[PDB]
Amino acid sequence: MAKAQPIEIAGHEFARKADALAFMKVMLNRYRPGDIVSTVDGAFLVEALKRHPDATSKIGPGVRNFEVRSADYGTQCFWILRTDGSEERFSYKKCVLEHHHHHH
């Protein structure tokens, strides 16, 4: 119960919050702003999404696929393509917690 365990996503146990982010950034940088994410990586993204309270709002009727597209300038982010034909975006950076360490 009260135990600081490693960050588990889709079975993958990361020894750090920044460690989980690294994995996502690696594959992210390996795609272009118009390419579809592989089913393997997508399966990870699904569980990485579901671990957020906004899950129902982001997903809607269901996840169809994930596309890598620009967030603002040069930066890449994962877009959720819904089965209804719509789309959404989520900031993977907050996969675990902020805990005041959000530096300004």
**What are the sequence ranges of the domains in the chain?**
1-104
Sheet holding 76-82, edge to edge: 35-36, 63-70, 76-82, 87-89
Query: Cα separation of 79 and 66, whole Å?
Result: 5
Crossing angle, helix 39-50 and helix 17-30, to 10 degrees? 140
Q: Regarding the domain delimited by 1-104, which CATH topology (the fold level of the hierarchy) does it fall under?
A: Nuclear Transport Factor 2; Chain: A, (3.10.450)
- Dihedral over alpha carbons 63, 87, 55, 33 (to 10 degrees): 90
AA identity, residue 68: V
Tokens of 22: 């690294």
Query: Cα separation of 68 and 34, whole Å?
Result: 6
Strands annotated E in 1-104: 7-9, 12-14, 35-36, 63-70, 76-82, 87-89
